[PDB]
Amino acid sequence: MRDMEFIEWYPRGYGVAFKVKRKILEEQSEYQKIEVYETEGFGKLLAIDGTVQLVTEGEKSYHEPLVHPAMLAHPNPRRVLIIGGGDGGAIREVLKHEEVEEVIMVEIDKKVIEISAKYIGIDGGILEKMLSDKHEKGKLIIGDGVKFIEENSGFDVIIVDSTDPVGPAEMLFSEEFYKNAYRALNDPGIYVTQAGSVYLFTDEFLTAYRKMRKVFDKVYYYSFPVIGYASPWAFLVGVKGSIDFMKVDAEKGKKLGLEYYDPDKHETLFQMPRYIVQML
Amino acid sequence: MEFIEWYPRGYGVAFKVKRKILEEQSEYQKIEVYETEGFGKLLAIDGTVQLVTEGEKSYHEPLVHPAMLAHPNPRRVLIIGGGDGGAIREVLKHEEVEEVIMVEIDKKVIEISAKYIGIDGGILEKMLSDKHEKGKLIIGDGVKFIEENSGFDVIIVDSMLFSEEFYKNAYRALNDPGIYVTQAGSVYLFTDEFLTAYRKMRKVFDKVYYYSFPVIGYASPWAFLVGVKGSIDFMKVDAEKGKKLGLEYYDPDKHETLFQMPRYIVQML
Ligand SMILES: CSC[C@H]1O[C@@H](n2cnc3c(N)ncnc32)[C@H](O)[C@@H]1O
Ligand SMILES: N=C(N)NCCCCNCCCN
DSSP, X not given: OOSEEEEEEEGGGEEEEEEEEEEEEEEEXXXXXXXXXXXXXXXXXXXXXXXXXXXXXXXXXXXXXXXXXXHHHSSOOOEEEEEEOTTSHHHHHHTTOTTOOEEEEEESOHHHHHHIIIIIOOSTTHHHHHHTTOOSSEEEEESOHHHHHTSOOOEEEEEEEOSOTTSTTGGGGSHHHHHHHHXXXXXXXXXXEEEEETTTSHHHHXXXXXXXXXXXXXXXXXXXXXXXXXXXXXXXXXXXXXXXXXXXXXXXXXXXXXXXXXGGGGGGGGOOOHHHHTTO | OEEEEEXXXXXXXXXXXXXXXXXXXXXXXXXXXXXXXXXXXXXEETTEEEEETTTTHHHHHHHHHHXXXXXXXXXXXXXXXXXXXXXXXXXXXXXXXOEEEEEESOHHHHHHIIIIIOOSTTHHHHHHTTOOSSEEEEESOHHHHHHHOOOEEEEEEEOOTTSHHHHHHHHHHEEEEEEXXXXXXXXXXXXXXXXXXXXXXXXXXXXXXXXXXXOSSSSSSEEEEEEEESSOOTTOOOHHHHHTTOOSSOOGGGGGGGGOXXXXXXXXX
């Protein structure tokens, strides 16, 4: 092979591969291994513990479906909480909603933020302001999201944009966490989290769904073809109050200028292989 | 050992492989079979994945059933390509089918699939001997075939098959009502090809539809295009007939979710 190659291997021996121009950096923080590559045709790739977090040319296919469905389904998302999202893509999308007054971002690994702000740069300067407490609506907090949620409440929308549930993110998918998360939501409130590869992390998705189903008033599932991840990726939604996640404010969405998630066709967001639906 | 198919922009689909089973150069292309570690056998043509046996239904179901279930009475069906037999197997799951003609250019693909892949449930063997009750195999070019054949309730393309002339003939070959459906490539990596086909079909068919589905074995999602003749509303399918199929991937009860498609692509139509 004349050029480099980055591959993330998934269960069953399936791999997502990218031709790369070079490796920009590798750093071992106290929590995980953070790496950055310059891909041949998808911009920069950020990886944590060998798993793709994003590719700069395509990351909107993940941040849009992760953020906007919930934000557009909530009648008035004024106070938002983001757990993880060290790269700033999620908060960037959240801040597109005028109703937003405050967004608290809890990241456990500050190195991810520093590295993203310096080498990824999809946040459009948001992370730097966050790092120096100079952002008007965003407030950065370095710590574990599980602990935070155990001591904080009052959120219209909670967005969990963490790594896979293995390292420090594992408890973000625990029964007790969902209890605290539900309690932390306002009425009406909405909780959303990425839930793994539909086809290869099916157990992760099913497990989290059943746990959320025992806590939230209503639990929804959906999927979206995320560029850079085994496709498609699943998302789980937990609602408190009278929120009809089956409906979103299309007019507010039109103002977002989205490229991937289509709020006008919100009903198509719920695609899911039949065999999996039958297991719910 | 690994098998990787590379797509535009250096994106790759990779499978860990246990062993290579066969390599044969037919008169048309190079055909290879590998046994993967966790996805069954992989049929590769000129280095491209035709299918992996543990996942191919994720492609053959959405390719076939939506159109078969949207049509009021699919008695006579045409399939262009589908040498692996996955499509014909799915078509024959519909009781209304009285005849299905399969037109394949490379006989070697059929023989290798029948012997080394075998997802077709023995259908290919019968057809290779001209002994299947409903299916009829024809070795030739689908383009020339549709130039002189008509009377199909459903036409499925699973293989010049995206030219306006071809689409005109395909439309003429359809009964009224009739449905034409074709796979249209990787949504994200072959966007231009998908758009080009969509536009040519719009100039020919009474109604044109598009949809996508998460396929295992290829850069996902995969796009599909539908051309209709007559009063068929592709946005509706017979859910009751769908239940009898026992599908694993395509969900007839949630047919509205079949039309997922990235926003920027819809805007370019
Ligand atoms: C890279 S985008 C997602 C982020 O989630 C962060 N993360 C993982 N686990 C937790 C946790 N328990 N609390 C807060 N943030 C987390 C990771 O450090 C990563 O930067
Ligand atoms: N195996 C994987 N590729 N897992 C990806 C985990 C979900 C994205 N983490 C957040 C990164 C984007 N903000």
